[PDB]
Write a protein that binds this DNA or RNA. Structure first.
Ligand SMILES: [Zn+2]
Length: 623
RNA sequence: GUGCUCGCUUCGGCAGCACAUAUACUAAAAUUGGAACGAUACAGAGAAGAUUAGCAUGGCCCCUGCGCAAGGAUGACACGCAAAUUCGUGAAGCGUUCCAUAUUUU
């Protein structure tokens, strides 16, 4: 009854959301642990719900204890839970059906001089376009990145909502703990926040006591904080955390216990962000790209903090240093900023008004291209990327292992600037590292394309748009050479240049003969309608003129000029070509290879099919 | 949220009363690396035992056609077809059973 069919004989489990490819696999799923566990959960939940009662209207600010002991006379209580948000209502779980029947049998209840609302409980079962439009009209790619920052950051209302949530959590925690504060970190304060980002909190006040404190935090969060659900603990890791959600505001996030290192990391990130102007748009763009291409997330992927540290390291290892090394920051931190946590020195200047500006001049487009290229080149497995020194330490030396005693090496090595034994890319497996390298190579060779270099006038998804939309390009390259009519190589190459220049209106530069060709209008389309107009006008004007060898090129040039004039409505300055390509001829077999260079609209296939019909006819009329 | 006030009101609201206050916060740990088993998809090779891989449409493909009627013209895109023959077995896809000095915030 929980199985819903699917095409190709598919089967799915509604509970587990797990598909099966055939009947035996479905039966195995139906008879194995995951499914039974879920049917036991649903059966127990439905039974408990049916043997349950709903209480409202009880006197304001009355604890569950007296209500439970009042209901004790009517039957054996099992669980009483009170509302978080306002405590208006409560649910009393009874350890039987008879007592639930007894309590629902009465038409009147009294407790503490207030008529109660005892009532049976119901049981129930378990920017795609606007972003593109906003980024499709900027002046250039740098403006696109700045606008991406503008429309991807946290809006002021969202900031207010997050601050209200933080204040609520602070209030409840101060109610429980004697003296404590909640320091928001991560995206909340490092100025690298996006819409719907994690709300990460630090609770400021050998392992059993830590586990007990984490369990206390989980119990307090589950039982007192209004609107939170899905509280779970990860007590066995480098930093035990408790995860939660928040139904009213829709937020989710993590709570850690004793990491001041996170606070210092966040302040360092803010200092880097306000130390130069390129870093914030660069990190936002790289995070959006990595999220789109499915290599940044949770688990076996680059955490976005690791991506932020990677782009910071890229900014550090340039010949003109865009950002200073953390060693330089530690040296330039004056007296009073010397602090250390867990035996590790975390010192850097507090205000950006003291450090000299970087002498780096190259804009954000060049920085993005250099990031792609340099990250694609690096020997990630054999090199440790040290942020404190801005240097690639040799991983095989053994020194980086015995120096820090806790460094877990791997396919990608990247040490956070303050913890000396916390390579932040230990999650990444080999497949994810290889995918990162390959996608970086793809982006690197895309950045050299003229589409990323010049904005589109007619609208062709220029700028970051291809790097944001997934649009995995699986298109084959030039595989079909065009056969040409047998002519002497010099005559054939001359006649091709005439046909491209005169009959098609291409700009042609000389690059086996080869030429770069560029087109601003769709000269392959419409030609049948243009020729019929020219033929009608000629038949109305002065019939005559026997067709010579020169008359064919002149007639195709006129058919091309008509197709320009029918689109002249455009007034945009024609600085970017609608389609550019190479034309290349082999000496022996006299075949023409044609390859795209810039095709912002995906129109190269239409041009190629047109040239396959047109060029072997043109070279027949030019013999 | 709704109704009432034989209360102020500026005429919206405010101040009290009445119903209602929703039907929880419920633990559905996850990820990675191993091993074994079941499947059966695998561009998987013969083929669909002379005879399939073709589709139907739309506007595009060129030529002819004054075309005004159109004809071949066959590649792209969208639209729904679906594919069994009879057959073996995977990789980072489906399912099941164990293992891990293995991982989880920033
Ligand atoms: Zn299931």
């Amino acid at each position: 009854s929980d199985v819903e069919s699917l095409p190709r004989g598919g089967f799915r489990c509604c509970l587990c959301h797990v598909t099966t490819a055939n009947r035996p696999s479905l039966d195995a799923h139906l008879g194995g642990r995951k499914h039974r566990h879920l049917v036991e959960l649903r059966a127990a939940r439905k039974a408990q719900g049916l043997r349950s009662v709903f209480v409202s209207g009880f006197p304001r600010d009355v604890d569950s204890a007296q209500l439970s002991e009042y209901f004790l006379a009517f039957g054996p209580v099992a669980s009483v839970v009170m509302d978080k948000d306002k405590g208006v209502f409560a649910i009393v779980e009874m350890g039987d059906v008879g007592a639930r029947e007894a309590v629902l049998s009465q038409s009147q209840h009294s407790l503490g001089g207030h008529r109660l609302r005892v009532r049976p409980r119901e049981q129930k079962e378990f920017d795609s376009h606007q972003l593109a439009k906003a980024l499709a009209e900027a002046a250039d790619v740098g403006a696109q990145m700045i606008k991406l920052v503008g429309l991807r950051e946290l809006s002021e209302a969202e900031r207010q909502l997050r601050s209200l949530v933080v204040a609520l959590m602070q209030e409840v925690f101060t109610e429980f703990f004697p003296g404590c504060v909640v320091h928001p970190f991560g995206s909340s304060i490092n100025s690298f926040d996006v819409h719907g980002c994690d709300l990460d909190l630090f609770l400021d006040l050998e392992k059993a006591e830590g586990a007990a404190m984490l369990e206390l935090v989980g119990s307090i969060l589950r039982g007192c904080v209004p609107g939170v659900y899905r509280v779970q603990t990860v007590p066995s890791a480098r930093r035990p955390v408790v995860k939660f959600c928040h139904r009213p505001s829709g937020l989710h996030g993590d709570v850690s216990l004793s990491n001041r290192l996170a606070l210092h990391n966040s302040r360092f990130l803010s200092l880097c962000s306000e130390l130069d102007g390129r870093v914030r748009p660069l990190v936002y763009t790289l995070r959006c790209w990595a999220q789109g291409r499915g290599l940044s997330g949770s688990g076996p992927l680059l955490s976005n903090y690791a991506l932020t540290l990677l782009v910071i390291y890229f900014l550090q290892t340039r010949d003109p240093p865009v950002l200073p090394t953390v060693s330089q920051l530690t040296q330039k931190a004056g007296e009073g900023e010397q602090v250390e946590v867990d035996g590790w020195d975390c010192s850097f200047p507090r205000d950006a008004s003291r450090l000299e500006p970087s002498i780096n001049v190259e804009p954000l487009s060049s920085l993005l291209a250099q990031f792609f290229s340099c990250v694609s080149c690096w020997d990630l497995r054999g090199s440790l990327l040290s942020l404190r020194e801005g240097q690639a330490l040799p991983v095989a030396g053994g020194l980086p292992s015995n120096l820090w005693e806790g460094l877990r090496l791997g396919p990608l090595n990247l040490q956070d600037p303050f913890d000396l034994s916390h390579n932040v890319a230990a999650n990444v497996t080999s497949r994810v590292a290889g995918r990162l390298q390959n996608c970086c190579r793809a982006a690197a060779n895309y950045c050299r394309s003229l589409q990323y270099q010049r904005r589109s006038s007619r609208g062709r998804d220029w700028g970051l748009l291809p790097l944001l939309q997934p649009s995995s390009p699986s298109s084959l390259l030039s595989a079909t050479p065009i056969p040409l009519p047998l002519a002497p190589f010099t005559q054939l190459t001359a006649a091709l240049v005439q046909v491209f220049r005169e009959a098609l209106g291409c700009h042609i530069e000389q690059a086996s003969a080869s030429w770069r060709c560029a087109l601003w209008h769709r000269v392959w389309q419409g030609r049948r309608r243009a020729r019929r107009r020219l033929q009608q006008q000629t038949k109305e004007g002065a019939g005559g003129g026997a067709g010579t060898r020169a008359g064919w090129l002149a007639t195709e040039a006129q058919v091309t000029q008509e197709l320009k004039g029918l689109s002249g409505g455009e007034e945009r300055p024609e600085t970017e070509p609608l389609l550019s390509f190479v034309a290349s001829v082999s000496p022996a077999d006299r075949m023409l290879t044609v390859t795209p260079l810039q095709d912002p609209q995906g129109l190269f296939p239409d041009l190629h099919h047109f040239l396959q019909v047109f060029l072997p006819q043109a070279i027949r009329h030019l013999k």
